[PDB]
Every structure is written in structure tokens, then in C-alpha cells.
Enzyme design. Structure first.
Site, PDB file in Angstrom:
ATOM      1  N   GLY A   1      -3.390  -3.125   8.856  1.00 57.62           N
ATOM      2  CA  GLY A   1      -3.748  -2.566  10.088  1.00 57.62           C
ATOM      3  C   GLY A   1      -2.741  -3.245  11.323  1.00 57.62           C
ATOM      4  O   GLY A   1      -1.779  -3.834  10.920  1.00 57.62           O
ATOM      5  N   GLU A   2      -2.972  -2.809  12.568  1.00 53.88           N
ATOM      6  CA  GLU A   2      -1.913  -3.349  13.651  1.00 53.88           C
ATOM      7  C   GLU A   2      -2.896  -3.413  14.801  1.00 53.88           C
ATOM      8  O   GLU A   2      -3.760  -2.855  14.859  1.00 53.88           O
ATOM      9  CB  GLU A   2      -0.632  -2.221  13.654  1.00 53.88           C
ATOM     10  CG  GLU A   2      -1.358  -0.901  14.027  1.00 53.88           C
ATOM     11  CD  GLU A   2      -0.055  -0.004  13.977  1.00 53.88           C
ATOM     12  OE1 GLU A   2       0.151   0.686  12.885  1.00 53.88           O
ATOM     13  OE2 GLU A   2       0.699  -0.170  15.003  1.00 53.88           O
ATOM     14  N   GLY A   3      -1.937  -3.847  15.907  1.00 61.95           N
ATOM     15  CA  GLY A   3      -2.591  -3.851  17.182  1.00 61.95           C
ATOM     16  C   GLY A   3      -1.578  -4.506  18.258  1.00 61.95           C
ATOM     17  O   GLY A   3      -0.289  -4.459  17.554  1.00 61.95           O
TER      18      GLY A   3
ATOM     19  N   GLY B   1       0.872  -6.929  16.789  1.00 61.73           N
ATOM     20  CA  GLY B   1       1.700  -6.690  15.761  1.00 61.73           C
ATOM     21  C   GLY B   1       1.018  -6.177  14.529  1.00 61.73           C
ATOM     22  O   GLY B   1       0.122  -5.432  14.811  1.00 61.73           O
TER      23      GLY B   1
ATOM     24  N   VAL C   1      -0.552  -6.278  10.305  1.00 60.54           N
ATOM     25  CA  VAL C   1      -1.002  -7.210   9.195  1.00 60.54           C
ATOM     26  C   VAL C   1      -0.963  -6.419   8.107  1.00 60.54           C
ATOM     27  O   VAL C   1      -1.346  -5.219   7.904  1.00 60.54           O
ATOM     28  CB  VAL C   1      -2.387  -7.972   9.417  1.00 60.54           C
ATOM     29  CG1 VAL C   1      -3.488  -6.881   9.510  1.00 60.54           C
ATOM     30  CG2 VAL C   1      -2.644  -8.948   8.698  1.00 60.54           C
TER      31      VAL C   1
ATOM     32  N   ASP D   1     -13.299 -16.418  22.829  1.00 57.10           N
ATOM     33  CA  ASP D   1     -13.107 -14.994  22.534  1.00 57.10           C
ATOM     34  C   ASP D   1     -13.821 -14.577  21.267  1.00 57.10           C
ATOM     35  O   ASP D   1     -13.476 -13.689  20.396  1.00 57.10           O
ATOM     36  CB  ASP D   1     -11.806 -14.347  22.380  1.00 57.10           C
ATOM     37  CG  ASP D   1     -11.613 -12.863  22.794  1.00 57.10           C
ATOM     38  OD1 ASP D   1     -12.765 -12.189  23.232  1.00 57.10           O
ATOM     39  OD2 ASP D   1     -10.725 -12.323  22.591  1.00 57.10           O
TER      40      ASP D   1
END
Ligand SMILES: Cc1cccc([C@@H](CO)NC(=O)[C@@H](C)N2Cc3ccc(-c4nc(NC5CCOCC5)ncc4Cl)cc3C2=O)c1
Length: 345
Positions: free
Chosen positions: A22-24, A27, A29, A139
Site C-alpha cells: 500500500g501507500e499514503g 510513502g 509499504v 492517534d
């Protein structure tokens, strides 16, 4: 170098056979095969150096996770970066690979009451350790709870964490943005900087509520809507609780609201275990001073099948950060320094 969805992953020779996960904003992964330990691992590529806020998050996570050692907290196993500050543009953080997270699991799976009990136990067990180090996660939310195939749980993302500072927690009305909206305590919007341990217990209560029904309990549509949802369920705060809010803007806002009664937890959660709802009520207390603490939560009858204080370890010492006056170029130096132990050398 191997390449993943366009990106260089400069992780070899140790780490091979990359697959995209995945990503966000953080950055990207991947899972990778670790040729030393002969397990697949998670590797996330972070490229934070053009944003002071990303440098802050990278440094905080690294500093905390390298100090912490706990079964319910994600580790850092390794860190890959260039041999010089000049050449370091990315930092690759290698972590134990987990199968899923609680956000994904809640969108797809009904949780038995035994699963809810066990996940909450593990959340609170990891949180005891974090709080015992005088740290606030700040968080906690389903997507920061990683799970493996046998439902072992690990808390992740320590980049928003802070050292607790209850004497400097007071602030004004509608100024603070701590945590992710649905998991943010009422006091954040009213009079709190989110520097007390009670911020995390609130987020845990929201998580428990969400595990009971697969839906967030306080689904605010935007920052200002969040208190409407909280008060919609909790009802109007009591005189006593209101009298704790000395700031007039916040006080008078609350006084301006029409009286609202408490929505009973057993009508919101008609299939829930009554012990779970008793604990839920104590975690979602309006007044942060009256809100249950992590060690009381572990000792609550809901968790009696698991509770074992001798197997709920604490940190060997309190944690010791002052990074908001530091420019991104200085933060890069500290990240370089902090990652040095993983270098050939
Ligand atoms: C914005 C920003 C800038 C600079 C830095 C950051 C940093 C510090 O705040 N934030 C992060 O890195 C935060 C945002 N993430 C992203 C991330 C991705 C994957 C994993 C992970 N996932 C698995 N398995 C998957 C689970 C789901 O289902 C498929 C499998 N296993 C092990 C791990 Cl470790 C963990 C994290 C984590 O902690 C943020």
C-alpha cells in the site's frame, strides 16, 4: 534496484522479492523477504526531508520505537538509508509483517465478543507500557492497530506521540486538532492540548464502541461536528463537569446548548456484553479527570479472563522531545544520527 509501482526500493542485498502492500502520505509499504532472518517483513519507504512535519513524525517514531520493546507494540527491526547525510533522500523502516489492521477487519468481519475482549485487552496492555514510559500515543484508531492471522495485536505509528505534560494541558476553545477526528476526546475542542494520558483512553473507548457494531460511534463530518456527535450520545455535561472548564468561551458554548439526555449504551449496543458496556461508559467519560486510567481498565471485570498485572509489563524508565523549533535540515541530522546503529559499521 527492485522497483514497485514506479518507485525505487533500494533495500538489498538483505531484502528481496518485494510485493506492494500500500501507500499514503507517509510513502509506500511493501513486504520483502529478509535473507538474514528468513521471514517476510514489512518495509516502508519514507521520503520526508522536504517537509518539517514529515521529519518530525519520522524522528519521533524512530526514537520511540527503538526504545520500546513490547509484544503489543510494533517494533523497528532495521533501518536502511544512504551512508552520508548528503546522499540520504529516503529512509526505509523495516518492521514485523502483519496480515491486516483493525480498520480493514471492521469493514469486513463481525467480531465475536471473545475477539472484542481479546483485542481490547491487547490494546490496553500495550497502552499500559506506553503510558508507563510517560508517553502519549495521540492517534489511536483502528488503522493503527495491526493484526496477524492468529489475532495478535500491535499498535503502530508513533510519529504523533508526545511526552505527557498534564500541568501545561490547558488552552482555549476550538483551537486544537489532536488525534484523528472520530477518535478525538471532547476536551480537545474545549480546553485541552492533548498532553494527558486521558486523551488515549478516550480513543480506546471509541475503538471499543466501533468493535461492538462495526460503525464509528461519533462519526463527525468535519472538525466542528465532532462535539455534536459526542454530546448527542453522552448528553449535556453536569454542573460539576462544566465547572471544571474555566475558559469562558468553552463554558458559555456548552451553556448555550439545549439540554440533551444520555443515550443508554444498552440501546446503542443491544447485543453487547453488559461488562463491555460498563467499561465503555468509563472510557467515554466526558470529564477527563474522571475518565478511567489504563491500569484500572485492565482490572475491569470485562477483562478478568486475561488480566495479569505481572504479565503486563512497564517501561524500564520514563522517556525523554522539543522538535517544533528545529528546522527540517536539523531534523534530518537527528534522523541520520538515530539510524546510525543499523549501518554496516
Ligand atoms: C505522514 C508521515 C510522514 C512521515 C512518517 C510517517 C510515519 C510516522 O508518523 N507513519 C507511518 O509510517 C504510518 C502512517 N504507517 C504506514 C504503515 C503502513 C503499513 C504498516 C504495516 N503494515 C503491515 N501489514 C499490512 C496491514 C494492513 O493490511 C495489509 C498488510 N505490517 C506491518 C506494518 Cl509496520 C504500518 C504503517 C505505519 O505505521 C507518516
Amino acid at each position: 534496484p527492485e522497483m514497485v509501482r514506479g518507485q525505487v526500493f533500494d533495500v538489498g542485498p538483505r531484502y528481496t522479492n518485494l510485493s506492494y502492500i500500500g501507500e499514503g502520505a507517509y510513502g509506500m509499504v511493501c513486504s520483502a523477504y529478509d535473507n538474514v532472518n528468513k521471514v517476510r517483513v514489512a518495509i516502508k519507504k519514507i521520503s520526508p526531508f522536504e517537509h518539517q512535519t514529515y521529519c518530525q513524525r519520522t524522528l519521533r517514531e524512530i526514537k520511540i520505537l527503538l526504545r520500546f520493546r513490547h509484544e503489543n507494540i510494533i517494533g523497528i527491526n532495521d533501518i536502511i538509508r544512504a551512508p552520508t547525510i548528503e546522499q540520504m533522500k529516503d529512509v526505509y523502516i523495516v518492521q514485523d509483517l502483519m496480515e491486516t489492521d483493525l480498520y480493514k477487519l471492521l469493514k469486513t468481519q463481525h467480531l465475536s465478543n471473545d475477539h472484542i475482549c481479546y483485542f481490547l485487552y491487547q490494546i490496553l496492555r500495550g497502552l499500559k507500557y506506553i503510558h508507563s514510559a510517560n508517553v502519549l500515543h495521540r492517534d489511536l484508531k483502528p488503522s493503527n492497530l495491526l493484526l496477524n492471522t492468529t489475532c495478535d495485536l500491535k499498535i503502530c505509528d508513533f510519529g504523533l506521540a508526545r511526552v505527557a505534560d498534564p500541568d501545561h494541558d490547558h488552552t482555549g476553545f476550538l483551537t486544537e486538532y489532536v488525534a484523528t477526528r472520530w477518535y478525538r476526546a471532547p476536551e480537545i475542542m474545549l480546553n485541552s492540548k492533548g498532553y494527558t494520558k486521558s486523551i488515549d483512553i478516550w480513543s480506546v473507548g471509541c475503538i471499543l464502541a466501533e468493535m461492538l457494531s462495526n460503525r464509528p460511534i461519533f462519526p463527525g463530518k468535519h472538525y466542528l461536528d465532532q462535539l455534536n456527535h459526542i454530546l448527542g450520545i453522552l448528553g449535556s455535561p453536569s454542573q460539576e463537569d462544566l465547572n471544571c472548564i474555566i475558559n469562558l468561551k468553552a463554558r458559555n458554548y456548552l451553556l448555550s446548548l439545549p439540554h440533551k439526555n444520555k443515550v443508554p449504551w444498552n440501546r446503542l449496543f443491544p447485543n453487547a456484553d453488559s461488562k463491555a458496556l460498563d467499561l465503555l461508559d468509563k472510557m467515554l467519560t466526558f470529564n477527563p479527570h474522571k475518565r478511567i486510567e489504563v491500569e484500572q481498565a485492565l482490572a475491569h471485570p470485562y477483562l478478568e479472563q486475561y488480566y495479569d498485572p505481572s504479565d503486563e509489563p512497564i517501561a524500564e524508565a520514563p522517556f525523554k522531545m522539543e522538535l517544533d523549533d528545529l528546522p527540517k535540515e536539523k531534523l534530518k541530522e537527528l534522523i541520520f544520527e538515530e539510524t546510525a546503529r543499523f549501518q554496516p559499521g
